[PDB]
Amino acid sequence: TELKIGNEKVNSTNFGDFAEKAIRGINHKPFVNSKGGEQKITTSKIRGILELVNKVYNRVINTNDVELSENILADIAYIKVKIAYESGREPVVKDFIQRTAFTAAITDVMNQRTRESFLLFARYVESLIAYFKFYGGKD
Amino acid sequence: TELKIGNEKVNSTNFGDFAEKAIRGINHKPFVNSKGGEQKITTSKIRGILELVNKVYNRVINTNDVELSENILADIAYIKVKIAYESGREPVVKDFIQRTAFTAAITDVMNQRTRESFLLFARYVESLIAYFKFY
Amino acid sequence: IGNEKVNSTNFGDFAEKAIRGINHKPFVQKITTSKIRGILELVNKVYNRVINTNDVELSENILADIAYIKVKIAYESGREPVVKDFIQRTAFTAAITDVMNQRTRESFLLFARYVESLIAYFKFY
Amino acid sequence: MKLVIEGTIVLKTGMHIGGSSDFSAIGAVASPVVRDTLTRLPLIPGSSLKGKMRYLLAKELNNGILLNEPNNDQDEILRLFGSSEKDKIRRARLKFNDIKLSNLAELETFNVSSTEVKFENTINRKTAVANPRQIERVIAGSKFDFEIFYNLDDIKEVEKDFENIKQGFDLLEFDYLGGHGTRGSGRIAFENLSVITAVGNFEKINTLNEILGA
Amino acid sequence: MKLVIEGTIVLKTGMHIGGSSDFSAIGAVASPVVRDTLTRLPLIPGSSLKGKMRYLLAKELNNGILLNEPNNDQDEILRLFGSSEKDKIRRARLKFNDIKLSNLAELETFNVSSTEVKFENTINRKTAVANPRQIERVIAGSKFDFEIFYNLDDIKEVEKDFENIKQGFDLLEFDYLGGHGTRGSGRIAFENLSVITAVGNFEKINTLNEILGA
Amino acid sequence: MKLVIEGTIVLKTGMHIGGSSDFSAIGAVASPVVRDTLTRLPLIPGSSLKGKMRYLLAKELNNGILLNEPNNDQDEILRLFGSSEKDKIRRARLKFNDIKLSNLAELETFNVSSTEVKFENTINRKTAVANPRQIERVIAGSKFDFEIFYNLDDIKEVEKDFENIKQGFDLLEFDYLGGHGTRGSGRIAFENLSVITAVGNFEKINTLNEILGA
RNA sequence: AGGAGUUGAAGCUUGGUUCAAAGAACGUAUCAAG
RNA sequence: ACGAGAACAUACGUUCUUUGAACCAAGCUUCAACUCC
C-alpha cells in the first residue's frame, strides 16, 4: 500500500504530486543528446510506455485476489525488460526513465507482489503521462 | 513455468534478474581472445541469435495448443544446431553461450515440449539482449 | 518423418554423438574442414532447387540429383581412407538409399538438416 | 403454475452490453462491459434481453413498423411483457433474469480470458485524421445459461405465448443483443431451449416444449 | 421480413487489419493482426468493413468528394448505414458481422500458416540509415465467408438499396480493406454473392439476387 | 471513379528483394528473396515499388538534392503518394499492389527455375582472405503484371499526375528496384503500359494512354 | 596428383501521428396540484 | 387490550445511436568466388 522509489516513499496520497514534481523537474532541466541542443522525449514513446502498462492494467482491474497471479507478474517482469531495452536504445528515454524513476517502482511492485501495489504503479504512470501532456503540449 | 540452467532455476517471474546477472557476468570479467586484449561479443551475432529464435516465436504465440508441434520443435532443434555452429565460428560466441547458459535452456525446451517453456525461453533471450543493449 | 531412427528433432543430437565418437579414438590424420564442406556444398546446391519447388513429392530431376551426389561421394570416398571412415561411421549412404526408397520432400529436408548438423558439430569440437 | 424457460445464449460475435460511463483510465479500455461484481464475471442483464425481445417481437407483430410508445403496442406484447397504462394494466407473465457466463471452465481450457478488447477508430473525413477507440467485448463462443420464469396465467393462451416467444427468439438470431451491433458485434444464437415446471407437473408440457425446442 | 446478404471476401493481397492487445517481442512483429481470441483465427471486424464501405459508397454518391460527418450523407447512405443526427435519426438497415477466416483447411492443404510476416524498412533521407519494422499480415488467397443482415422495411426502396450495396462492393473491389493499403496490401474481391431470406419469403427475391449476382 | 494503371515490369538483371522468415542452411543461401507466401512464388512488394518511385520522383522534382523528411516533399509527390503532417493529410491517389510473378509458364518453356543463387564474397584487403555469401536472386527476363489504382480526385490535375507517373516510370529504368542494386541488380523495364476505367467512362482517356504508354 | 580456409561480417530491430467524439442524463402512474 | 389495525415503494422502459486502428516509411546500406602453394 506504499511503494518505495528512492529515500522517500509514495502511496495513494502522493503519486500525482510525485509525478507532477518529476515532470516539472524534467522541464527546467531537460536532457541533452550529446549535441548542442536539448531534446526531450516525444509523445509517442511515452504513449508506448503507457500502452505497455495498460496491457496489464486492462487485466488486473478485473481480478479477484489481493495478490497478483503469476502470468500478471510475468508480464510485469517483461515490462521491466521492455523499459530497460527501450531506454538503452535511446538516451532520451533513459533520462526520462531514470529521472521519473520507473525501474525502481516496477521492481518494488515485483517485491510486494500485491494488486494494490500494481494499481499504485499504474495510476502513477497514468498521472505521469497526464502531467506530461498538461505541461507544454504540442497538440 | 519451469526451466533449468544448472542446479539453478529460472521461472516466469524471474528471467529479467538472471538476464541482469548473466550480462553483468559477461561484463566485469569479459572474454580473452587468446591474447592480452579484451573482446566482447558484437550486436549482430547475438541479435542474429534473436532472429533465430523469433523465426519460431512468430509461429508459437500465434497458436493455441499447450504442446508444441513437431515442425516447431524441429526448428527448435535447428536453433540448437545453429547455436553450436556459430559457437564454432567464434570463440567469443562460445563463451557468451557458455556463460549465459543458452544450450541448457534450449535443451530444457527440447525436454519439456510445452508451449509455455519455449515462451519463457523467448522471454529469457529477449531479456538477455535487452540487458546487453542497456549496458 | 521416421527416416531410419532419426526424427525431425534428434538429428543434431545424433550428429553430436557421431562427432564425439569421431573426436576420441579417431582414424589413425583426422579429417579436415574442406572435404566435409564440399559434401555440404553439393548437398545444399541440391537443397536450393529442392526447397524452391512447389509440391510434396519429388521430380525426376531431383532423384537424378540425389543419385549423382551419391556417385560423387562414392568417388570422394574412393579418394581418401579418412573420408571412408567418416562416411562409414555416419549413416550417410544409408540416408541416401532411404531417400531413394522413400522419395519424400520432408525426408530430404531432414537429411539436409542432418548433414548440416554434421558440419556444425564437427565445427563445434 | 409457473414454468421455467431454460436455455443457453451462445455468442457469435462480441456482445458489448453495459458499463459505467465513468472514467476508466487514460490509455486503457474505455466503457467496460457489465459484470457481476462479486465474481466480476461478464454479465447479460435481463433488462437488455427483455427490451430487445420486446422491440423485435412487437415489430413482427403490428406487421411492419413500430412507431409507438411501449405501454400500448399489441395485446400479445402487453400480456407477455407487462403493462402500465392508467385504466388498463395487466402483469407480465415473463420474469427475465440476470444471465451470468457459464463456460468459463471451457474458456480456461483454451487459455483465454472471458473478455477481450477491440480496438476501433474513426476517420474525420475533412482532415483524414484518426480518433481511436477501445471497447471491452465479451469473446465469441461465450455461453450464457439463462432462466426465464413464465407465469401461466391462463391455459387458453400458453401455446400462443410460446409461439410468440419462439418467434422473438428466432428474431434475435438475426439481430444483435446489445451495443455496437451494426459494427459487427452482438450476434447471438439461442440453443438448448426447454421448459420445465417449478412445482408439481404440467400435463400438456410437450406441445410447449417442441414448439419452443424446434 | 429480413434478408441475409451472403457472400465471401477473397484476398488478392495481404490485408493487415488491426491492433492487439498483445505484448510484443523485441525482434518480432510490431502491430500484429487482429484475431478472434477464442480460436486465434484472423478476423475482419465488421466495423472496418462497414466504415470502408460507407466511406466509398458515400464518396460515389455525393458525386465527387465528401468532406462532411457521417450524419450529413444523403438519405440513401443514412438509411443504409444508420444515423445519429439529433432529430432525423434513422435505424441502420444493415447489420454487419465480425468475419472470421473461413478457408483455413484449404490454407493448410498447401502447408502454410494462416498469416505471414512481411519485412519492411524505411531509410532516413539524409543519413541513409534503415529502420526495419515487421508487420503481421494475412496471406493472400484467404477467403472470408461473410453475411450481412438487411432489414426490409420499405418494399419500394429495396431495389435502390441493393443497387447501392452492389455499387459499394464494386467500389471496394478497387480499394483496400484495411491497414497498409497504399503500400501494397488489402486488395480484396467479392465472390459467391447472393441474398436469402431469414424466415418466410420475399416476393421479388430474384430481382435482388440478380442485381448482386453480376 | 477510379483508373487502373495496368502494366508489366520486365526484369533485365537480378532484383533480389526482401527478408524472409526462412531458416537458412549454412552451406546454402542466406537472406533469401521475398515470396508470395501462399505458394511462396516470387513477389515484388508494393511498398518497395512505392518507396523507389517516391524516392526517384522526389529527386527529379526538387531537381537534384534531397535531405528532407518524406512529408516535406513537393505538392505533386504528396498528392500522389500521401501525407501524414498534422494539418494537411493527403489521401493518396495511387494504390500500389503486391506484384506476383506471372510468366512462370514462360520460364518453364525455357526450362529454368524462377530464381537463382548468386555467389559473392568479400576480400578483406589486408590479408586477402575472403568472406563468402549466397543471395537468392530472381532471374532476368521475368515479367511482373501489375495494376495501380489511380483514384481520380479532379480532372484538372490528372494530366499532370500521369505525366509525373510516367516520369517516375522513366526514372526507375536507370536505377535499381531493390537489394544489392548498386552492384548489378534490380534493373527493371516498364513494358506495355496502359490505363483503363474501373466503372463508367473517362471521356479524355485517349490522351492519357498517349502521355503514359509512349 | 591438387591440397587448406573464409561459408557470411558489420549497422538499424520500428520512427513519428491523433490515444474514447457527439447524443440521451431518467420518463411516467398512484402521492400531490386543481 | 400499544395513535393502533390491514398495506411489496411497486408497475412500465435495450447503456443504446453514429465512428476503417488509421495515415506516412525501399529489408535496405557497405562487400571482387577469392587467396596461397
Side-chain angles (χ1 to χ4, degrees), chain A residues 52 55-56 75 78-79 82 85, chain E residues 20-26 131:
Chain A
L52 281 188
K55 283 169 187 287
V56 189
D75 290 322
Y78 182 75
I79 289 171
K82 286 280 286 181
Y85 171 64
Chain E
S20 306
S21 186
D22 291 331
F23 264 95
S24 296
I26 71 169
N131 190 10

Side-chain angles (χ1 to χ4, degrees), chain D residues 26-27 30 86 129-133:
Chain D
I26 280 181
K86 184 70 190 273
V129 75
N131 187 351
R133 177 71 57 186

Side-chain angles (χ1 to χ4, degrees), chain D residues 91-119:
Chain D
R91 280 181 58 88
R93 299 188 181 145
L94 266 60
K95 203 270 192 192
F96 286 78
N97 288 318
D98 273 5
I99 321 169
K100 286 161 78 178
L101 188 139
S102 66
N103 65 330
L104 182 72
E106 301 184 21
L107 264 54
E108 281 292 322
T109 56
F110 275 48
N111 290 318
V112 65
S113 70
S114 68
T115 190
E116 65 182 1
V117 174
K118 187 202 280 296
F119 282 72

Side-chain angles (χ1 to χ4, degrees), chain C residues 32-35 37 79-80:
Chain C
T32 72
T33 181
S34 175
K35 277 74 69 177
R37 201 266 301 163
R79 178 65 65 192
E80 277 161 41

Side-chain angles (χ1 to χ4, degrees), chain E residues 133-146:
Chain E
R133 65 185 182 273
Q134 300 177 27
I135 43 177
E136 195 166 36
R137 198 182 70 172
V138 193
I139 63 170
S142 294
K143 296 175 174 62
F144 281 87
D145 311 324
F146 66 99

